[PDB]
Amino acid sequence: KLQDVVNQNAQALNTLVKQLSSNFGAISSVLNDILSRLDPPEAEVQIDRLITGRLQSLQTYVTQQLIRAAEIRASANLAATKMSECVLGQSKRVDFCGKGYHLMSFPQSAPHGVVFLHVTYVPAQEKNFTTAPAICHDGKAHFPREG
Amino acid sequence: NLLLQYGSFCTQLNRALTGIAVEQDKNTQEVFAQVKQIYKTPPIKDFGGFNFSQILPDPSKSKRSFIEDLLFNKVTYIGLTVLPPLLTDEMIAQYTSALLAGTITSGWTFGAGAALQIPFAMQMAYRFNGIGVTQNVLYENQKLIANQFNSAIGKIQDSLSSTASALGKLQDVVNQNAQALNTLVKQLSSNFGAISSVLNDILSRLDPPEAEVQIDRLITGRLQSLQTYVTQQLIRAAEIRASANLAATKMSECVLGQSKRVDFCGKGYHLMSFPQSAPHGVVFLHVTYVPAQEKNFTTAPAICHDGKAHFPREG
Amino acid sequence: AYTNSFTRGVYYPDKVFRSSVLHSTQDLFLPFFSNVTWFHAPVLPFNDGVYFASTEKSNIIRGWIFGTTLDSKSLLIVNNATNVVIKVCEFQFCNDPFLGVTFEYVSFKNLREFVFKNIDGYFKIYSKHTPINLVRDLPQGFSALEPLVDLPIGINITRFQTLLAAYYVGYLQPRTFLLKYNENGTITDAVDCALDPLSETKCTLKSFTVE
Amino acid sequence: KGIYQTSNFRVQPTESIVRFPNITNLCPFGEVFNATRFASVYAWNRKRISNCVADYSVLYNSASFSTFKCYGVSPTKLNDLCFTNVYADSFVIRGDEVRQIAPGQTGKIADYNYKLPDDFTGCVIAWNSNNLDSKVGGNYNYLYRKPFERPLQSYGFQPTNGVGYQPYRVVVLSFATVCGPKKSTNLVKNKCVNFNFNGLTGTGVLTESNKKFLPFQQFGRDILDITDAVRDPQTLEILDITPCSFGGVSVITPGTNTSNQVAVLYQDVNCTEVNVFQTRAGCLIGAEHVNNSYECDIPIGAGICASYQTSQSIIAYTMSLGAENSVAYSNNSIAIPTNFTISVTTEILPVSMTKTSVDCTMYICGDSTECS
């Protein structure tokens, strides 16, 4: 997950920088060429094409950043809840603290994220028994208080 | 030849939609794949009188439960393609049958460790103990609680079968995707200020040094419409993910367990829930204890016997 | 005199087949529940297009002159005993025109409905035969008109005269209609979107059923 | 290790077909070019050529006229063109006047008898008339004196004379309704082809359909106005259009540092169209099917997964959901754990993005005020 988030930020910025090399139908992708090869009244049409291109890219990138920021906040609020419940307490919420009945967890810092060591209790060696839902004594029924 | 001049805009959309497509298998696993074994039901249905023949899979058939086939009946080419789900519905039927067969034969323990057998009335005697009802109230009522729940499952057939609007959310999600792809196709016929939407006729009608400007208007319009569709798809997928994560959370607490969270597992004090698969989604049958007929009594916070005060231990 | 355009003058907009679909379009249509000028038997303009609906036991209405002067300054459309002449010519009619008791073509109990339209330099005709008797006027059922001809002519048609007991005329208006094509590819129903707020809703949902 | 969408592939069309109606209703060229007579050079006579097939390929191929020469058109291309409305003008005159049959000219014909507009787009020709319009008593019908302006005397036209005095049956056709024949071609079925019906270009697998168009209908449309069907204009039969077979081409691999053989997946195509194995997800190639099931290593779709295994190969299999387990339930049996494990288990969550900021003017317009 963390390496994926770092990869997505890298791919987004790497795409965004690569867009500067693209023509968008201008006579060159090098802005300084357009500003020196052609006279301003001619050149401005090509520059307005290139601005329209780069601006569409920037609005794309910012929209991808916002859509991803909403995902990272949904992750951060889930993390904050797991830290409020599962570090600062013992959540009875089954499988909210990794596989098992839950005891405690320890947070660890990580680059752009957090890691939890969840200390779960998981039963292991079982024996199978004859059971009864309650037990008679004097024809009155007795029930277990716990177990 | 012109589309290449616009850079990564043909790549990053295919990447973005692949990022959705990979995640849909993930959402389906985060919800349903919460068990590491496919549990099998026993042949005899001696669940203390609780008739699950309507919610377990029918072996005579796809091997789905009866209440699932109602759901499958109730919910109804030019460059776009729908990839298949990684998990076919005849596998989601096995996962939901495993979750269900575990919940029946073993209650919550198959969420924690190995599945442990426990007789179903002896499980319900815990489910009651978990909502502060002492379990003598279960066995002293077992034949009635069986009849209540059998009857209540009976109303689920009628609720899903007789009413047309019953699956509003799944039909809404299918409808939104239908109208999105329908819009995306309609937009190909839009002029965007070119002399036509028929790209072949533009090339037929005008000199290539001119026709490039007409084609530039169509490419600009269509690409902006594709980005619109992809952005709507990503925003919609973020919502379907928040729904799937909530479903996974419910399946973790409310199928594999008993959530004490009031009005999370539907209304009432929650006992247990049974999942059922549905087209593009999931259904939960939340079984909840709702208190029904109250008498009104005089009360006192605590009582005095010897000048000593006494308080209720567990009441 | 006048009578009700109850539900008439729907025609197939284009040479397209569409099946079990609620396609919606704008064209020159007879607006629903308009009043037609009814004639029992007379110059009439041709404002944009004409819905036309004569019923006669022997089809004595046989010729219509469509043009600018109706005289020697231009379509003579004329049915005869086994043929249908059409030509554009500068020609003439009398102070009381009647029939004695550049193109070419060949073809009460009944009502030979038509719609006549000139648009984009092209003039065209559509038809239905009407199997059902009612002596009063054009029935309250539904029926769509199929095409019969087209010509390019380049003439700014202004008005017309029809020669021979009744005929009816209603001018077309640009409107959005929604059309119920059935399985067989025939129009079974239509909604005039401008008629009433319910029609403005049907043309919003496409569906004939509104929840 | 994984699966990667390397490419998208499309079946290219194997043929191009063009279809139009039966080629009836031609213009009456024999009423002008094959006529028994032609009008005086001072009085050229006009007829009409419109609302017809104008079969100009017959005139462009013809050797009977000395030259069917055009003032503003191509004679071989004219069968593919249309004139707004065509006038056919005809006259008989001495062959010495044949040079006058052109725009921008002088003499008794071109400036005083059979003159033409300076901008006149039209095609003109003549057939030699010493065997057809001259006579040994003199061809007295050769009378000669604004554009087309239909004081004068007969030309000295004769059959035994030289080609200046020998007459010719001259005519020309001027430059909607004067439209040439649209060329049909043979039909094709069940192959991906380009097609062009009456005005309907496209590309697809054509197939004979069971749909029932009304007698006036020519195209079928789907719900989203996708062109779904057509009627053939020569045999009145109705075709479905299926789009040419296309899909993604995903490549399936173990890690490169574990092996180099790869399996290729063509999504949603029949394998015939491309070892080989059909799946509900598409056609799979280079992998091989097995009856066993395993935990899903690389996903294919539709319940199929692939992995690299034993002599090694890429196998593909219906995925296991994990091992199955019947629980030993009864109305009286309980299993209780007697011992336990304290499994420490990791969970990981991202918590922040790279806190980016952008100088949007440096990105859009870096180093230029003229851009800014």
Curated annotation (Swiss-Prot), chain A:
Residue ranges of coiled coil: 3-47
Phenotype for residue 4 to N: In strain: Delta/B.1.617.2, Mu/B.1.621
Outcome reported for the amino acid change (mutating residue 36 to A): In strain: Alpha/B.1.1.7
Effect on the protein of changing residue 125 to H: In strain: Kappa/B.1.617.1
Disulfide bonds: 86-97
Glycosylation sites recorded in the entry for this protein: 128
Annotated effect of mutating residue 81 to I: In strain: Gamma/P.1
Main function: Subunit of the fusion protein that is processed upon entry into the host cell. Mediates fusion of the virion and cellular membranes by functioning as a class I viral fusion protein. Contains a viral fusion peptide that is unmasked after S2 cleavage. This cleavage can occur at the cell membrane by host TMPRSS2 or during endocytosis by host CSTL. In either case, this triggers an extensive and irreversible conformational change that leads to fusion of the viral envelope with the cellular cytoplasmic membrane, releasing viral genomic RNA into the host cell cytoplasm.
Protein name: Spike protein S2'
Organism: Severe acute respiratory syndrome coronavirus 2
Source species taxonomy: Viruses, Riboviria, Orthornavirae, Pisuviricota, Pisoniviricetes
Portion of the full-length sequence here: 947 to 1093 of 1273
UniProtKB/Swiss-Prot annotation, chain D:
Disulphide bridges: 27-52, 70-123, 82-179, 192-244, 271-283, 296-305, 365-371
Mutation effect (residue 131 to K): In strain: Omicron/BA.1, Omicron/BA.2, Omicron/BA.2.12.1, Omicron/BA.2.75, Omicron/BA.4, Omicron/BA.5, Omicron/BQ.1.1, Omicron/XBB.1.5, Omicron/EG.5.1
Effect of residue 34 to Q: Reduced viral infectivity
Integrin-binding motif, as annotated region: 94-96
BetaCoV S1-CTD domain boundaries: 25-181
Annotated consequence of substituting residue 144 to F: In strain: B.1.1.298
Impact when changing residue 108 to T: In strain: Gamma/P.1
Effect of residue 307 to A: No effect on O-glycosylation by host GALNT1
Region of interest: Receptor-binding domain (RBD): 10-195
Region of interest (Disordered), ranges: 10-26, 176-195
Residues with glycosylation annotation: 14, 16, 22, 34, 257, 270, 291, 310, 331, 339
Identification of the protein by name: Spike protein S1
Taxonomic classification: Viruses, Riboviria, Orthornavirae, Pisuviricota, Pisoniviricetes
